[PDB]
PDB file of all heavy atoms in Angstrom:
ATOM      1  N   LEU N  24     190.254 112.178 -87.117  1.00  8.99           N
ATOM      2  CA  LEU N  24     191.666 112.360 -86.693  1.00  8.99           C
ATOM      3  C   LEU N  24     192.096 113.800 -87.007  1.00  8.99           C
ATOM      4  O   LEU N  24     192.279 114.160 -88.214  1.00  8.99           O
ATOM      5  CB  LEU N  24     192.592 111.334 -87.332  1.00  8.99           C
ATOM      6  CG  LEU N  24     192.311 109.875 -86.968  1.00  8.99           C
ATOM      7  CD1 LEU N  24     193.372 108.954 -87.546  1.00  8.99           C
ATOM      8  CD2 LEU N  24     192.199 109.705 -85.474  1.00  8.99           C
ATOM      9  N   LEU N  25     192.258 114.603 -85.965  1.00  6.57           N
ATOM     10  CA  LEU N  25     192.677 116.019 -86.080  1.00  6.57           C
ATOM     11  C   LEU N  25     194.030 116.131 -86.754  1.00  6.57           C
ATOM     12  O   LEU N  25     194.924 115.275 -86.541  1.00  6.57           O
ATOM     13  CB  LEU N  25     192.680 116.686 -84.705  1.00  6.57           C
ATOM     14  CG  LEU N  25     191.338 116.667 -83.966  1.00  6.57           C
ATOM     15  CD1 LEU N  25     191.516 117.268 -82.582  1.00  6.57           C
ATOM     16  CD2 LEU N  25     190.221 117.345 -84.720  1.00  6.57           C
ATOM     17  N   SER N  26     194.158 117.182 -87.582  1.00  7.88           N
ATOM     18  CA  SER N  26     195.430 117.600 -88.239  1.00  7.88           C
ATOM     19  C   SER N  26     195.965 116.522 -89.182  1.00  7.88           C
ATOM     20  O   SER N  26     197.174 116.501 -89.396  1.00  7.88           O
ATOM     21  CB  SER N  26     196.473 117.982 -87.220  1.00  7.88           C
ATOM     22  OG  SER N  26     196.086 119.131 -86.458  1.00  7.88           O
ATOM     23  N   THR N  27     195.119 115.672 -89.746  1.00  4.66           N
ATOM     24  CA  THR N  27     195.591 114.600 -90.667  1.00  4.66           C
ATOM     25  C   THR N  27     195.295 114.937 -92.132  1.00  4.66           C
ATOM     26  O   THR N  27     195.728 114.153 -93.011  1.00  4.66           O
ATOM     27  CB  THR N  27     195.028 113.214 -90.302  1.00  4.66           C
ATOM     28  OG1 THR N  27     193.607 113.190 -90.397  1.00  4.66           O
ATOM     29  CG2 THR N  27     195.541 112.782 -88.949  1.00  4.66           C
ATOM     30  N   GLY N  28     194.497 115.960 -92.376  1.00  3.31           N
ATOM     31  CA  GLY N  28     194.080 116.387 -93.731  1.00  3.31           C
ATOM     32  C   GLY N  28     194.891 117.596 -94.179  1.00  3.31           C
ATOM     33  O   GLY N  28     196.130 117.543 -94.115  1.00  3.31           O
ATOM     34  N   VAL N  29     194.195 118.680 -94.529  1.00  5.80           N
ATOM     35  CA  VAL N  29     194.860 119.910 -95.037  1.00  5.80           C
ATOM     36  C   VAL N  29     195.712 120.581 -93.935  1.00  5.80           C
ATOM     37  O   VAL N  29     196.539 121.424 -94.292  1.00  5.80           O
ATOM     38  CB  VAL N  29     193.836 120.871 -95.661  1.00  5.80           C
ATOM     39  CG1 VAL N  29     193.080 120.245 -96.834  1.00  5.80           C
ATOM     40  CG2 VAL N  29     192.839 121.384 -94.636  1.00  5.80           C
ATOM     41  N   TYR N  30     195.622 120.204 -92.651  1.00  8.85           N
ATOM     42  CA  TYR N  30     196.490 120.749 -91.571  1.00  8.85           C
ATOM     43  C   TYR N  30     197.706 119.858 -91.300  1.00  8.85           C
ATOM     44  O   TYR N  30     198.448 120.142 -90.384  1.00  8.85           O
ATOM     45  CB  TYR N  30     195.709 120.939 -90.264  1.00  8.85           C
ATOM     46  CG  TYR N  30     194.888 122.195 -90.143  1.00  8.85           C
ATOM     47  CD1 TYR N  30     194.643 123.035 -91.232  1.00  8.85           C
ATOM     48  CD2 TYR N  30     194.294 122.527 -88.951  1.00  8.85           C
ATOM     49  CE1 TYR N  30     193.840 124.159 -91.115  1.00  8.85           C
ATOM     50  CE2 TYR N  30     193.491 123.638 -88.811  1.00  8.85           C
ATOM     51  CZ  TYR N  30     193.279 124.475 -89.891  1.00  8.85           C
ATOM     52  OH  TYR N  30     192.487 125.602 -89.794  1.00  8.85           O
ATOM     53  N   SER N  31     197.904 118.787 -92.071  1.00  7.49           N
ATOM     54  CA  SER N  31     198.974 117.775 -91.829  1.00  7.49           C
ATOM     55  C   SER N  31     200.354 118.293 -92.264  1.00  7.49           C
ATOM     56  O   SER N  31     201.351 117.644 -91.912  1.00  7.49           O
ATOM     57  CB  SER N  31     198.651 116.470 -92.522  1.00  7.49           C
ATOM     58  OG  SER N  31     198.775 116.616 -93.930  1.00  7.49           O
ATOM     59  N   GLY N  32     200.420 119.396 -93.021  1.00 12.03           N
ATOM     60  CA  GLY N  32     201.714 119.891 -93.558  1.00 12.03           C
ATOM     61  C   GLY N  32     202.333 118.858 -94.510  1.00 12.03           C
ATOM     62  O   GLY N  32     203.591 118.749 -94.543  1.00 12.03           O
ATOM     63  N   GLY N  33     201.463 118.119 -95.206  1.00  7.90           N
ATOM     64  CA  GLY N  33     201.772 117.102 -96.231  1.00  7.90           C
ATOM     65  C   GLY N  33     202.447 115.848 -95.694  1.00  7.90           C
ATOM     66  O   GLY N  33     203.162 115.152 -96.480  1.00  7.90           O
ATOM     67  N   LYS N  34     202.251 115.547 -94.402  1.00  7.47           N
ATOM     68  CA  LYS N  34     202.820 114.356 -93.721  1.00  7.47           C
ATOM     69  C   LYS N  34     201.690 113.396 -93.337  1.00  7.47           C
ATOM     70  O   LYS N  34     200.533 113.839 -93.244  1.00  7.47           O
ATOM     71  CB  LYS N  34     203.622 114.735 -92.469  1.00  7.47           C
ATOM     72  CG  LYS N  34     204.995 115.328 -92.739  1.00  7.47           C
ATOM     73  CD  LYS N  34     205.965 115.167 -91.585  1.00  7.47           C
ATOM     74  CE  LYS N  34     207.282 115.882 -91.818  1.00  7.47           C
ATOM     75  NZ  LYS N  34     208.089 115.945 -90.580  1.00  7.47           N
ATOM     76  N   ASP N  35     202.032 112.117 -93.190  1.00  9.46           N
ATOM     77  CA  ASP N  35     201.125 111.080 -92.662  1.00  9.46           C
ATOM     78  C   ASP N  35     201.218 111.171 -91.154  1.00  9.46           C
ATOM     79  O   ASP N  35     202.274 110.904 -90.581  1.00  9.46           O
ATOM     80  CB  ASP N  35     201.509 109.724 -93.269  1.00  9.46           C
ATOM     81  CG  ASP N  35     200.813 108.524 -92.672  1.00  9.46           C
ATOM     82  OD1 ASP N  35     200.093 108.684 -91.679  1.00  9.46           O
ATOM     83  OD2 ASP N  35     200.978 107.432 -93.238  1.00  9.46           O
ATOM     84  N   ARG N  36     200.108 111.563 -90.523  1.00 11.37           N
ATOM     85  CA  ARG N  36     200.065 111.769 -89.072  1.00 11.37           C
ATOM     86  C   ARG N  36     199.011 110.846 -88.478  1.00 11.37           C
ATOM     87  O   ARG N  36     198.518 111.176 -87.396  1.00 11.37           O
ATOM     88  CB  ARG N  36     199.771 113.240 -88.757  1.00 11.37           C
ATOM     89  CG  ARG N  36     200.858 114.172 -89.266  1.00 11.37           C
ATOM     90  CD  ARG N  36     200.677 115.600 -88.835  1.00 11.37           C
ATOM     91  NE  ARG N  36     201.725 116.428 -89.483  1.00 11.37           N
ATOM     92  CZ  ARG N  36     202.957 116.629 -89.022  1.00 11.37           C
ATOM     93  NH1 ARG N  36     203.363 116.160 -87.862  1.00 11.37           N
ATOM     94  NH2 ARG N  36     203.809 117.359 -89.751  1.00 11.37           N
ATOM     95  N   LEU N  37     198.653 109.756 -89.169  1.00  8.07           N
ATOM     96  CA  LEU N  37     197.650 108.809 -88.617  1.00  8.07           C
ATOM     97  C   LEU N  37     198.070 108.438 -87.201  1.00  8.07           C
ATOM     98  O   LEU N  37     197.263 108.569 -86.250  1.00  8.07           O
ATOM     99  CB  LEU N  37     197.555 107.573 -89.522  1.00  8.07           C
ATOM    100  CG  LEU N  37     196.378 106.621 -89.248  1.00  8.07           C
ATOM    101  CD1 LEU N  37     196.226 105.632 -90.382  1.00  8.07           C
ATOM    102  CD2 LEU N  37     196.512 105.881 -87.949  1.00  8.07           C
ATOM    103  N   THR N  38     199.245 107.847 -87.047  1.00  5.32           N
ATOM    104  CA  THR N  38     199.689 107.312 -85.747  1.00  5.32           C
ATOM    105  C   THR N  38     199.803 108.431 -84.708  1.00  5.32           C
ATOM    106  O   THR N  38     199.327 108.271 -83.555  1.00  5.32           O
ATOM    107  CB  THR N  38     200.983 106.522 -85.929  1.00  5.32           C
ATOM    108  OG1 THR N  38     200.689 105.437 -86.809  1.00  5.32           O
ATOM    109  CG2 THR N  38     201.464 106.013 -84.590  1.00  5.32           C
ATOM    110  N   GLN N  39     200.350 109.569 -85.090  1.00  4.86           N
ATOM    111  CA  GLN N  39     200.580 110.694 -84.139  1.00  4.86           C
ATOM    112  C   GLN N  39     199.212 111.169 -83.618  1.00  4.86           C
ATOM    113  O   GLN N  39     199.014 111.329 -82.392  1.00  4.86           O
ATOM    114  CB  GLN N  39     201.337 111.823 -84.839  1.00  4.86           C
ATOM    115  CG  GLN N  39     201.418 113.102 -84.041  1.00  4.86           C
ATOM    116  CD  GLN N  39     202.117 114.182 -84.841  1.00  4.86           C
ATOM    117  OE1 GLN N  39     202.107 114.181 -86.069  1.00  4.86           O
ATOM    118  NE2 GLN N  39     202.686 115.117 -84.113  1.00  4.86           N
ATOM    119  N   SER N  40     198.272 111.344 -84.526  1.00  4.36           N
ATOM    120  CA  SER N  40     196.966 111.941 -84.207  1.00  4.36           C
ATOM    121  C   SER N  40     196.167 110.916 -83.400  1.00  4.36           C
ATOM    122  O   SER N  40     195.528 111.309 -82.373  1.00  4.36           O
ATOM    123  CB  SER N  40     196.272 112.356 -85.417  1.00  4.36           C
ATOM    124  OG  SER N  40     195.046 113.043 -85.078  1.00  4.36           O
ATOM    125  N   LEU N  41     196.160 109.653 -83.862  1.00  5.32           N
ATOM    126  CA  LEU N  41     195.387 108.584 -83.177  1.00  5.32           C
ATOM    127  C   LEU N  41     195.922 108.380 -81.760  1.00  5.32           C
ATOM    128  O   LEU N  41     195.135 108.154 -80.853  1.00  5.32           O
ATOM    129  CB  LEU N  41     195.440 107.290 -83.994  1.00  5.32           C
ATOM    130  CG  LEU N  41     194.675 106.096 -83.398  1.00  5.32           C
ATOM    131  CD1 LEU N  41     193.190 106.433 -83.249  1.00  5.32           C
ATOM    132  CD2 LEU N  41     194.872 104.847 -84.241  1.00  5.32           C
ATOM    133  N   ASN N  42     197.229 108.425 -81.558  1.00  3.84           N
ATOM    134  CA  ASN N  42     197.794 108.140 -80.215  1.00  3.84           C
ATOM    135  C   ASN N  42     197.400 109.283 -79.302  1.00  3.84           C
ATOM    136  O   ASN N  42     197.069 109.044 -78.138  1.00  3.84           O
ATOM    137  CB  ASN N  42     199.289 107.882 -80.256  1.00  3.84           C
ATOM    138  CG  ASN N  42     199.588 106.471 -80.707  1.00  3.84           C
ATOM    139  OD1 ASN N  42     198.735 105.592 -80.620  1.00  3.84           O
ATOM    140  ND2 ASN N  42     200.809 106.257 -81.149  1.00  3.84           N
ATOM    141  N   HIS N  43     197.346 110.514 -79.820  1.00  2.00           N
ATOM    142  CA  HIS N  43     196.897 111.634 -78.961  1.00  2.00           C
ATOM    143  C   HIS N  43     195.403 111.495 -78.657  1.00  2.00           C
ATOM    144  O   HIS N  43     194.986 111.871 -77.541  1.00  2.00           O
ATOM    145  CB  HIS N  43     197.232 112.954 -79.621  1.00  2.00           C
ATOM    146  CG  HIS N  43     198.666 113.320 -79.563  1.00  2.00           C
ATOM    147  ND1 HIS N  43     199.459 113.112 -78.447  1.00  2.00           N
ATOM    148  CD2 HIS N  43     199.432 113.983 -80.460  1.00  2.00           C
ATOM    149  CE1 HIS N  43     200.662 113.622 -78.678  1.00  2.00           C
ATOM    150  NE2 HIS N  43     200.685 114.126 -79.895  1.00  2.00           N
ATOM    151  N   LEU N  44     194.627 110.959 -79.583  1.00  2.49           N
ATOM    152  CA  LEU N  44     193.189 110.712 -79.369  1.00  2.49           C
ATOM    153  C   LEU N  44     193.079 109.699 -78.217  1.00  2.49           C
ATOM    154  O   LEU N  44     192.365 109.937 -77.249  1.00  2.49           O
ATOM    155  CB  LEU N  44     192.590 110.172 -80.657  1.00  2.49           C
ATOM    156  CG  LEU N  44     191.075 110.007 -80.686  1.00  2.49           C
ATOM    157  CD1 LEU N  44     190.618 109.954 -82.123  1.00  2.49           C
ATOM    158  CD2 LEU N  44     190.618 108.768 -79.942  1.00  2.49           C
ATOM    159  N   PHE N  45     193.820 108.608 -78.314  1.00  3.40           N
ATOM    160  CA  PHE N  45     193.775 107.576 -77.239  1.00  3.40           C
ATOM    161  C   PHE N  45     194.185 108.176 -75.901  1.00  3.40           C
ATOM    162  O   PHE N  45     193.515 107.876 -74.858  1.00  3.40           O
ATOM    163  CB  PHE N  45     194.695 106.402 -77.601  1.00  3.40           C
ATOM    164  CG  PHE N  45     194.213 105.456 -78.665  1.00  3.40           C
ATOM    165  CD1 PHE N  45     195.145 104.795 -79.451  1.00  3.40           C
ATOM    166  CD2 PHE N  45     192.874 105.267 -78.958  1.00  3.40           C
ATOM    167  CE1 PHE N  45     194.739 103.916 -80.432  1.00  3.40           C
ATOM    168  CE2 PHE N  45     192.466 104.369 -79.931  1.00  3.40           C
ATOM    169  CZ  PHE N  45     193.400 103.688 -80.669  1.00  3.40           C
ATOM    170  N   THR N  46     195.266 108.951 -75.858  1.00  4.53           N
ATOM    171  CA  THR N  46     195.791 109.511 -74.586  1.00  4.53           C
ATOM    172  C   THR N  46     194.670 110.289 -73.889  1.00  4.53           C
ATOM    173  O   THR N  46     194.503 110.183 -72.673  1.00  4.53           O
ATOM    174  CB  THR N  46     197.055 110.340 -74.812  1.00  4.53           C
ATOM    175  OG1 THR N  46     198.032 109.409 -75.262  1.00  4.53           O
ATOM    176  CG2 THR N  46     197.530 111.067 -73.567  1.00  4.53           C
ATOM    177  N   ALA N  47     193.913 111.045 -74.669  1.00  6.34           N
ATOM    178  CA  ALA N  47     192.849 111.916 -74.147  1.00  6.34           C
ATOM    179  C   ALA N  47     191.621 111.081 -73.781  1.00  6.34           C
ATOM    180  O   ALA N  47     191.008 111.347 -72.720  1.00  6.34           O
ATOM    181  CB  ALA N  47     192.506 112.963 -75.193  1.00  6.34           C
ATOM    182  N   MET N  48     191.204 110.181 -74.634  1.00  8.47           N
ATOM    183  CA  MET N  48     189.859 109.573 -74.540  1.00  8.47           C
ATOM    184  C   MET N  48     189.895 108.296 -73.682  1.00  8.47           C
ATOM    185  O   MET N  48     188.833 107.853 -73.320  1.00  8.47           O
ATOM    186  CB  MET N  48     189.271 109.283 -75.912  1.00  8.47           C
ATOM    187  CG  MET N  48     189.151 110.537 -76.804  1.00  8.47           C
ATOM    188  SD  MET N  48     188.147 111.842 -76.068  1.00  8.47           S
ATOM    189  CE  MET N  48     186.556 111.034 -75.987  1.00  8.47           C
ATOM    190  N   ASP N  49     191.065 107.748 -73.391  1.00  8.06           N
ATOM    191  CA  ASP N  49     191.105 106.432 -72.690  1.00  8.06           C
ATOM    192  C   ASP N  49     190.433 106.525 -71.330  1.00  8.06           C
ATOM    193  O   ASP N  49     189.890 105.510 -70.881  1.00  8.06           O
ATOM    194  CB  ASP N  49     192.534 105.950 -72.553  1.00  8.06           C
ATOM    195  CG  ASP N  49     193.094 105.226 -73.743  1.00  8.06           C
ATOM    196  OD1 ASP N  49     192.340 104.896 -74.704  1.00  8.06           O
ATOM    197  OD2 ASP N  49     194.323 104.937 -73.679  1.00  8.06           O
ATOM    198  N   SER N  50     190.536 107.662 -70.636  1.00  8.72           N
ATOM    199  CA  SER N  50     189.956 107.855 -69.283  1.00  8.72           C
ATOM    200  C   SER N  50     188.484 108.244 -69.361  1.00  8.72           C
ATOM    201  O   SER N  50     187.844 108.312 -68.299  1.00  8.72           O
ATOM    202  CB  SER N  50     190.745 108.865 -68.475  1.00  8.72           C
ATOM    203  OG  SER N  50     190.638 110.164 -69.064  1.00  8.72           O
ATOM    204  N   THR N  51     187.923 108.440 -70.559  1.00 13.54           N
ATOM    205  CA  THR N  51     186.470 108.670 -70.697  1.00 13.54           C
ATOM    206  C   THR N  51     185.721 107.335 -70.861  1.00 13.54           C
ATOM    207  O   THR N  51     186.333 106.322 -71.295  1.00 13.54           O
ATOM    208  CB  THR N  51     186.138 109.608 -71.872  1.00 13.54           C
ATOM    209  OG1 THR N  51     186.358 108.896 -73.096  1.00 13.54           O
ATOM    210  CG2 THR N  51     186.901 110.913 -71.829  1.00 13.54           C
ATOM    211  N   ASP N  52     184.425 107.319 -70.551  1.00 15.20           N
ATOM    212  CA  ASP N  52     183.599 106.093 -70.674  1.00 15.20           C
ATOM    213  C   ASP N  52     182.571 106.237 -71.785  1.00 15.20           C
ATOM    214  O   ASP N  52     181.705 105.366 -71.918  1.00 15.20           O
ATOM    215  CB  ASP N  52     182.930 105.767 -69.332  1.00 15.20           C
ATOM    216  CG  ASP N  52     181.931 106.770 -68.812  1.00 15.20           C
ATOM    217  OD1 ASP N  52     181.652 107.781 -69.498  1.00 15.20           O
ATOM    218  OD2 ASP N  52     181.465 106.561 -67.664  1.00 15.20           O
ATOM    219  N   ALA N  53     182.764 107.186 -72.706  1.00 14.48           N
ATOM    220  CA  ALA N  53     181.942 107.245 -73.928  1.00 14.48           C
ATOM    221  C   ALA N  53     182.393 106.206 -74.960  1.00 14.48           C
ATOM    222  O   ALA N  53     183.611 105.969 -75.108  1.00 14.48           O
ATOM    223  CB  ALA N  53     182.000 108.656 -74.489  1.00 14.48           C
ATOM    224  N   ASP N  54     181.469 105.617 -75.727  1.00 16.09           N
ATOM    225  CA  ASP N  54     181.827 104.831 -76.926  1.00 16.09           C
ATOM    226  C   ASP N  54     182.404 105.823 -77.936  1.00 16.09           C
ATOM    227  O   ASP N  54     181.763 106.844 -78.199  1.00 16.09           O
ATOM    228  CB  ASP N  54     180.666 104.064 -77.542  1.00 16.09           C
ATOM    229  CG  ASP N  54     180.312 102.779 -76.815  1.00 16.09           C
ATOM    230  OD1 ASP N  54     181.208 102.218 -76.125  1.00 16.09           O
ATOM    231  OD2 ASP N  54     179.132 102.427 -76.866  1.00 16.09           O
ATOM    232  N   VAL N  55     183.618 105.585 -78.406  1.00 12.84           N
ATOM    233  CA  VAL N  55     184.269 106.495 -79.385  1.00 12.84           C
ATOM    234  C   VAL N  55     184.185 105.817 -80.735  1.00 12.84           C
ATOM    235  O   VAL N  55     184.606 104.636 -80.880  1.00 12.84           O
ATOM    236  CB  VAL N  55     185.717 106.806 -78.989  1.00 12.84           C
ATOM    237  CG1 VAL N  55     186.436 107.532 -80.117  1.00 12.84           C
ATOM    238  CG2 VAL N  55     185.808 107.561 -77.699  1.00 12.84           C
ATOM    239  N   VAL N  56     183.709 106.536 -81.744  1.00 14.51           N
ATOM    240  CA  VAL N  56     183.659 106.025 -83.136  1.00 14.51           C
ATOM    241  C   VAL N  56     184.475 106.984 -83.999  1.00 14.51           C
ATOM    242  O   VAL N  56     184.154 108.137 -84.091  1.00 14.51           O
ATOM    243  CB  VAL N  56     182.240 105.872 -83.684  1.00 14.51           C
ATOM    244  CG1 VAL N  56     182.230 105.304 -85.101  1.00 14.51           C
ATOM    245  CG2 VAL N  56     181.419 104.992 -82.761  1.00 14.51           C
ATOM    246  N   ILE N  57     185.578 106.495 -84.505  1.00 12.13           N
ATOM    247  CA  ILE N  57     186.523 107.300 -85.318  1.00 12.13           C
ATOM    248  C   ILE N  57     186.068 107.214 -86.763  1.00 12.13           C
ATOM    249  O   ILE N  57     185.825 106.105 -87.263  1.00 12.13           O
ATOM    250  CB  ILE N  57     187.951 106.789 -85.113  1.00 12.13           C
ATOM    251  CG1 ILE N  57     188.363 106.870 -83.651  1.00 12.13           C
ATOM    252  CG2 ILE N  57     188.884 107.525 -86.054  1.00 12.13           C
ATOM    253  CD1 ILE N  57     189.633 106.081 -83.299  1.00 12.13           C
ATOM    254  N   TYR N  58     185.975 108.348 -87.441  1.00 14.83           N
ATOM    255  CA  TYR N  58     185.542 108.440 -88.848  1.00 14.83           C
ATOM    256  C   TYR N  58     186.750 108.759 -89.719  1.00 14.83           C
ATOM    257  O   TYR N  58     187.504 109.664 -89.409  1.00 14.83           O
ATOM    258  CB  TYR N  58     184.376 109.403 -89.022  1.00 14.83           C
ATOM    259  CG  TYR N  58     183.093 108.839 -88.485  1.00 14.83           C
ATOM    260  CD1 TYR N  58     182.842 108.772 -87.116  1.00 14.83           C
ATOM    261  CD2 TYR N  58     182.119 108.342 -89.349  1.00 14.83           C
ATOM    262  CE1 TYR N  58     181.682 108.210 -86.633  1.00 14.83           C
ATOM    263  CE2 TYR N  58     180.951 107.764 -88.874  1.00 14.83           C
ATOM    264  CZ  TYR N  58     180.717 107.730 -87.510  1.00 14.83           C
ATOM    265  OH  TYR N  58     179.593 107.120 -87.069  1.00 14.83           O
TER     266      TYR N  58
END
């Protein structure tokens, strides 16, 4: 999840980052494995 660690500006961005991941990757047909 991009920008959720030291780039988060000390905020919880799980939902923000994950929803942007989904927006981008939903139209791809690769198996996505989130770490």
Side-chain angles (χ1 to χ4, degrees):
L24 297 186
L25 302 176
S26 296
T27 62
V29 300
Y30 278 11
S31 71
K34 284 204 186 168
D35 171 354
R36 297 187 185 274
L37 191 168
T38 298
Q39 170 183 27
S40 185
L41 180 60
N42 280 339
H43 285 320
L44 187 160
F45 285 151
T46 294
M48 302 302 296
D49 276 351
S50 66
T51 72
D52 64 3
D54 281 336
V55 170
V56 182
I57 301 166
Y58 287 75

